[PDB]
Design a protein around this ligand. Structure first.
Ligand SMILES: *[C@@H]1O[C@H](CO)[C@@H](O)[C@H](O[C@@H]2O[C@H](CO)[C@@H](O)[C@H](O)[C@H]2NC(C)=O)[C@H]1NC(C)=O
Ligand SMILES: OC[C@H]1O[C@H](OC[C@H]2O[C@@H](O)[C@H](O)[C@@H](O)[C@@H]2O)[C@H](O)[C@@H](O)[C@H]1O
Ligand SMILES: OC[C@H]1O[C@H](OC[C@H]2O[C@@H](O)[C@H](O)[C@@H](O)[C@@H]2O)[C@H](O)[C@@H](O)[C@H]1O
Ligand SMILES: OC[C@H]1O[C@H](OC[C@H]2O[C@@H](O)[C@H](O)[C@@H](O)[C@@H]2O)[C@H](O)[C@@H](O)[C@H]1O
Ligand SMILES: OC[C@H]1O[C@H](OC[C@H]2O[C@@H](O)[C@H](O)[C@@H](O)[C@@H]2O)[C@H](O)[C@@H](O)[C@H]1O
Ligand SMILES: *[C@@H]1O[C@H](CO)[C@@H](O)[C@H](O)[C@H]1NC(C)=O
Ligand SMILES: *[C@@H]1O[C@H](CO)[C@@H](O)[C@H](O)[C@H]1NC(C)=O
Ligand SMILES: *[C@@H]1O[C@H](CO)[C@@H](O)[C@H](O)[C@H]1NC(C)=O
Ligand SMILES: *[C@@H]1O[C@H](CO)[C@@H](O)[C@H](O)[C@H]1NC(C)=O
Ligand SMILES: *[C@@H]1O[C@H](CO)[C@@H](O)[C@H](O)[C@H]1NC(C)=O
Ligand SMILES: *[C@@H]1O[C@H](CO)[C@@H](O)[C@H](O)[C@H]1NC(C)=O
Ligand SMILES: *[C@@H]1O[C@H](CO)[C@@H](O)[C@H](O)[C@H]1NC(C)=O
Ligand SMILES: *[C@@H]1O[C@H](CO)[C@@H](O)[C@H](O)[C@H]1NC(C)=O
Ligand code: NA
Ligand code: NA
Ligand code: NA
Ligand code: NA
Lengths: 452, 452, 452, 452
């Protein structure tokens, strides 16, 4: 454990990034309309407060060497976008790359950290996503990558404006080891894609290669989760592993895959940044994003990512030859435990565990193993497709339906035993008894255990 | 994406290198006779404009430390060879090594970059192949290799003469990551050899070891293609992965192996440098080199290397225990798609795919997956063995037979719907239907899909 | 071989560390009560002389930048704890980390080595455990880790007070290669845990990955032993591989697992630091710790770690899929040999070897292979559960029961043929004959061979 | 190819090292008696001219920092040993380590290169074996190891006395890549041992791990040969891979294993340094060492190590689970070819090949594949056990029996068609015909092919 380096990231950040769905075709108008939508839908007040502008926003540099925002896309400048966002109680993110160019070929910040940090401060930016394209040979060992990333960290600090600092170097040179002292989160892999399991030749490292020499992209949800599994021990208050933006409401993932994806990103204390087009967001994907109970896990005070207890390969493999089952378990701040039974097989199956596996670090005869625990389904009381479609078509308000974390923080709601945050009691687990369920294909059983 | 670093390599380079067939036994006369031949055969005007002189050309250094060309082999000097080439509208390549010696033991350029760059400029050289033999311990991490290669890059730039810069360090220290900002292409492996699949003990890294510590040589065509597969995402306008000179018309590859080799080098946007002895070039190998349709893929404006969609091992293995099948697919600038079904098995087989696999990045219900696509065989209208033998024996001209890209660029020919560049329509592919063919052993089915 | 760098560590150190059982909840009173206990139980005079205070002891830094011990936990300061310990003939250990923070987030010593070394000297500290948390990017290659650790080594030396120097960097960057010239021992892995075999996702490197990029923790006893196996050749007088504190009397290991664990740590010349709560130490675990015969192996003058002769996987696997059998053998200073037959299978089994396997480096026809050897059981005459429970409840003294190594060193006791140190003769082994026994599940047969 | 860096090592060196059989128990008298023996036995005049004194020769340093030879072991100093050796036409080798200590703990040369080089020059030393123990963190990347080794290289050069420079860093940090420009040979692995195949836990890298992080020792003959296999392409005139001293006449290898070992070290152009106790050398081992025909392969002018053509695992495995078969083939300077069929299986087997496999780099229809080749057995006319025992007991002279390479160099003897150097013609190999033999367990068929 260590204090946060800058006082931010006390829990993993939440928000939205305009990329996964809009590429270089961004404007003040897109960004603010979408911002309005996220507020209207009650997602802002759930915690999704960072509106992150991604690549392709700039037009080059002025005569003083200073970044210039594209005047066609942003006729009032960035500072003006910031103010609008702040006036609707949003936080504002921007993007650059620790290299000569950004990934899409725009001006990068390598060797221009001071001016560029100053640009972000002058434009009242609250958050920086900091990429790793065209890094000019400045990678290959922990030391050289750390110093390249420390250079922007220090330059942001020098501006005296608080900036949440988000590393995007894909776990290159063992980022989990060095990120915390200079940054609030770090991408620990190549880009995610809307595929639950699919191996891809553009993502050459498999789920077991957490230390990868070619991060790539188009990595599956499970490839990324698998790489992240040993890394939980290097995350914590102030500095989080980042498993990349959520693909919920993007492409063609099933409701089960989307739930597993969301539940798992939450449990390992990843940032929850929406990759969906929230103006073309479908009903089922919306109610996944807005599941307060699950966000409560992510936003646990003094957050500890959960541990993979076990992993087995099954014969029920999918069209891509993939098929495994996993159990994860982790402690929660109020003494509760989160448990996940994850069915990455291609068929529905019975899944099972015991108290000895759940409290994998408790001794025989300890109180945890000797006591009874009520089981709470974290997926109960999810917003039905009807209500969600209503809200999405502006026929019903989100107010009084969605949990309002701005009004009541996750910590305080948890203290007040707030039903919206614990799911639904479905049973109890005694010593020497098994916990059984049937878990859908590419799905999840996701529980919170509380003492009886 | 990033701009070209020097304005060259807007498409992968094409030409000829005198090595694969002539070793140290080079002269002004060999080089110019061969040059004449490449022009006469219509290959120059197809795009094969770089005549690259390789190792063993020098005799040492003069009293000022300056490279001295062998006076027996080049009695008029290199500048004189350059002028002759330029007067027949050719471009001129030379060779050195980023080390103390070249691979064949001639003077290398390490620490002598300024003088040596100046030598190339003074002799009006247009292209440099820059090797990695005897590098004096200056390798082992990305940073140290990058700086060694940047040293020649900067020295070439300082001369003010445009020089296409071709790295030859065999992918050592992850060249795909750092090449583009200092160079126009980079060898991503040990030397190729005229063997389609054959594992070799002098090439210890298998096709899956893209990050290799001992690049070696005598690597098979498939070993090299396999290593190159994840790397396409780091290639693009201005900076290309180099899979080494073509072995078409060299050794004893079959017509099928030669077609697969050529089609695959094209599709991943490798340079197409002829390794053949063009004065002892056989009929079938000639018509492979001169297939305009396939070169059109390589010379696509705003080039994107294709992606390996899938790869499976088969039981139909060859004399060396090798046998796999692959599907590759990639977008083309005008909206078309290139598709390859590659049969590395030892027996002819039926091969098949669908629109969902071809447009592997398109969503269900998108227009691409919802529309019909005409299939064009990129191997149709290939110059028959008769016509090719005629041309080769100086009994028929190439004029009016071969596509003349000097007269009409590949881009413009593609715009004009020029039949010579699209192959032959053979069918159409509808939603929910399969695309089937029979693909020869160690062969390829190579298509261009256009919207109906 | 090399001299000890500082004159210490002539044999592996022994003692106790307050962590495995007490975490941050430490005080002068805990530490001294426990110290009293270790003396009373006769363990001190067996060799367990280092009382090591671990993380969480400090409260920050004073106005001069100097470490400040927590005044609530240590109202008299550390120097006062030291004096008490020294007055009962104990040695005193403290802890820091070669990073910005300690693992539990207290002040670390990186860049503060001189002051911090001086703090330890001023407080009369005899031993330093030096961790690797929050090392600020200063790892990744042997050179950078060596210099970071050399910095504290030199600063300790500069104080002129002898300090036993114990590296805790988990074998990162091949510590076995560079530790000896700057240190007396080095952790060669992630943290141990009270699990004999259990794979854990927080310890991603398996037993075969001695060169690990993510040491982690919760590694099994066998995972750690397996990683240590090639490393014995880089240990010796003055500088020892450290396989982490003993889990004997911690969690729920069986008596067999505890014996194997203890016997194996001894044989490879690891430090024997008690991880147990000695005030809540059970009878069986106590008599394992106090087995003089086995400690005699660890404390062999001119110590050579034993060699793994063979390793095989068995079908008798445990609940975690683990199951292997091993034979280890090593020379002893007086010409004797230590032999271990280790049953990591889940079932009791017959185990067997010969003289040719025991003297794996002796030639055919040599005297060793030609002679007869008496077999001594190193586990005979172990303190029975009754006597141990008596001593533990303060109903019987340890005096005259336990070997007193303060009175008679292990070397001198070995010379005097002292029965307490050789175990019990159980037979003899002749040329061309097999040595057979039945070895319990997760257990060990542990012998000393002496010439007939 | 590159010139020799210092003009030496035009062929691999030959000689004797006093270690494998005498450890630290060395003297002027041992060394000179043994020297006398090597001359008397005719081995000197065969090429075994370097008498290499190994570790444990020094007693520390004098008041000027200068190495001091042990006055008990060398009462006249080293220079006096040198002169004696030179007066019997021998060359003289000494030893140090690129570290703080030598492997046996004597003074090392790290940071003391100038004085120590000067010591070797002052004592008229002709050869240096330069180890890698206690290198103080100065390893881990090619660059850092190269510079450490270059430091002694330059210091030797500065003395102006020719010194054959032999690196002993066990292939650490890819020595094959950088050795040639600073040295005449380089150990490419951990120490050999008298075991043909035996895996050992002190040698964790298997035969496929040529790039090893823990070289270790007690590596088998086949483990070392396997690691060396890709490396032949980086050896050549002036700079050789070193597979460690010969174990012929050491331990208990069979006559077949000894022949295979010797034949294979020769074929890959390793140094041939005798590890045997030549005063306790058995008859069969002697006639292996003195096989002129095989040494002729090693001492080929313009030496090219042979290539492994193929390798297969067999079911006929030994007591250690090992069993493979290999074919090697390489060109010789006079146009001949060396072929080896190696039976690492546990049983005698038929072995076979063709001309297409022998001339693995020749095209179909080339002259090599189209011609007939006489097969010569390189093991014929070996000195029978009787004659060898006679010579060894000083009952018969070696003169007129052994080839005298001092009188007639291997090159010149090869030119003169000297029967002693080509073995015995046993047949001929035609196109489209197979070459068959039966090869003993752990043995070799070792041929020279000459054009008919
Ligand atoms: C995934 O495939 C579904 C069919 O199951 C397909 O409908 C989605 O594309 C979306 O289709 C929507 C149907 O309501 C259409 O209204 C919506 O505009 C469309 N989204 C896009 C980008 O065209 C697929 N999912 C997504 C979001 O791509
Ligand atoms: O309390 C310090 C402790 O550190 C070691 O354990 C390291 C362990 O600490 C946690 O911070 C991380 O989550 C985990 O990844 C690390 O491995 C060390 O082994 C021990 O001696 C002790 O100093
Ligand atoms: O638009 C920037 C984008 O970069 C990341 O994706 C990196 C991706 O970009 C392409 O240039 C390459 O072809 C591919 O190899 C790279 O992996 C990053 O993950 C994302 O957050 C975003 O900044
Ligand atoms: O006597 C020096 C000797 O060193 C080599 O053997 C290295 C060997 O030495 C031991 O100190 C270690 O336990 C073991 O790990 C090392 O591998 C070298 O091969 C040899 O030539 C010789 O100089
Ligand atoms: O003639 C130069 C040549 O070098 C390359 O081939 C490298 C090859 O050369 C030999 O010296 C070695 O034995 C072998 O190990 C090396 O791989 C390069 O691929 C080629 O373009 C050309 O410049
Ligand atoms: C800058 O750094 C110091 C810690 O070094 C910290 O106290 C402060 O909050 C930082 N300021 C900003 C704006 O990040
Ligand atoms: C809501 O919709 C999703 C897909 O859009 C579907 O999978 C799910 O079953 C629906 N929920 C219910 C309870 O029907
Ligand atoms: C040299 O460098 C600059 C870019 O840094 C570029 O504009 C110019 O074209 C280069 N000149 C040559 C001849 O490569
Ligand atoms: C042309 O020749 C090649 C080999 O030289 C042969 O494989 C091929 O079948 C020939 N083409 C046709 C259509 O016969
Ligand atoms: C400090 O270093 C020297 C060796 O360099 C050693 O003789 C001395 O004992 C050391 N002192 C202490 C207290 O460690
Ligand atoms: C002593 O106790 C341990 C467990 O506490 C038990 O396994 C062992 O069998 C006992 N010893 C004897 C000889 O009964
Ligand atoms: C020293 O170096 C030069 C080459 O740099 C070489 O010509 C000379 O022979 C060397 N001298 C010795 C004695 O090694
Ligand atoms: C010579 O002796 C060796 C072993 O010392 C034996 O293996 C070999 O067969 C003998 N040679 C002959 C031809 O008998
Ligand atoms: Na406005
Ligand atoms: Na001319
Ligand atoms: Na006191
Ligand atoms: Na004398």
């Amino acid at each position: 454990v260590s204090p946060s380096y800058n006082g931010l990231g006390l829990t993993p950040q939440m928000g939205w990034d305009n990329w996964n769905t809009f590429a270089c075709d961004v404007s003040e108008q897109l960004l603010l309309d979408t911002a309005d939508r996220i507020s209207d839908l009650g997602l802002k007040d759930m915690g999704y407060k960072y509106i992150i502008l991604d690549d392709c926003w700039s037009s080059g540099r002025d005569s003083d060497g200073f970044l210039v925002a594209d005047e066609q896309k942003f006729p009032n400048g960035m500072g003006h976008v910031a103010d609008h966002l702040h006036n609707n109680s949003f936080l504002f993110g921007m993007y650059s790359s620790a290299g000569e160019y950004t990934c899409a070929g725009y001006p990068g910040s390598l060797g221009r950290e001071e001016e560029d940090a100053q640009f972000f401060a002058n434009n009242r930016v609250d958050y920086l996503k900091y990429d790793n394209c065209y890094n000019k040979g400045q990678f290959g060992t922990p030391e050289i990558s750390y110093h390249r990333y420390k250079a922007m960290s220090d330059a942001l600090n020098k501006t005296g404006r608080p900036v949440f600092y988000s590393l995007c170097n894909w776990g290159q040179d063992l980022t989990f080891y060095w990120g915390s002292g200079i940054a609030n989160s770090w991408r620990m892999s190549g880009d995610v894609t809307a595929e639950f399991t699919r191996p891809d030749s553009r993502c050459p490292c498999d789920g077991d290669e957490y230390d990868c020499k070619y991060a790539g992209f188009h990595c599956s949800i499970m490839n990324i989760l698998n790489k992240a599994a040993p890394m939980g021990q290097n995350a914590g208050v102030g500095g989080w592993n980042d498993l990349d933006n959520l693909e919920v409401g993007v492409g063609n993932l099933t409701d089960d895959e989307e739930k597993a994806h969301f539940s798992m990103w939450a449990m390992v204390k990843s940032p929850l940044i929406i990759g969906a087009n929230v103006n073309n967001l479908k009903a089922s994907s919306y109610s996944i994003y807005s599941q307060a109970s699950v966000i409560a896990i992510n936003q646990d005070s003094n957050g500890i990512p959960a541990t993979r207890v076990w992993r087995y390969y099954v014969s029920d493999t999918d069209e891509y030859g993939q098929g495994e089952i996993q159990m994860w378990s982790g402690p929660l701040d109020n003494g509760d435990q989160v448990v996940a039974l994850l069915n990455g097989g291609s068929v529905s199956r019975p899944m099972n565990t015991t108290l000895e596996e759940i409290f994998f670090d408790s001794n025989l005869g300890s109180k945890k193993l000797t006591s009874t625990w009520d089981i709470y389904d974290l997926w109960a009381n999810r917003v039905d497709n009807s209500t969600a479609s209503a809200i999405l078509g502006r026929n019903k308000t989100a107010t009084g339906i969605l949990y309002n974390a701005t009004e009541q923080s996750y910590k305080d709601g948890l203290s007040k035993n707030d039903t919206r945050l614990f799911g639904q009691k479905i049973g109890s687990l005694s010593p020497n008894a098994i916990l059984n369920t049937t878990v859908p294909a590419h799905g999840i059983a996701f529980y919170r255990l509380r003492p009886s």
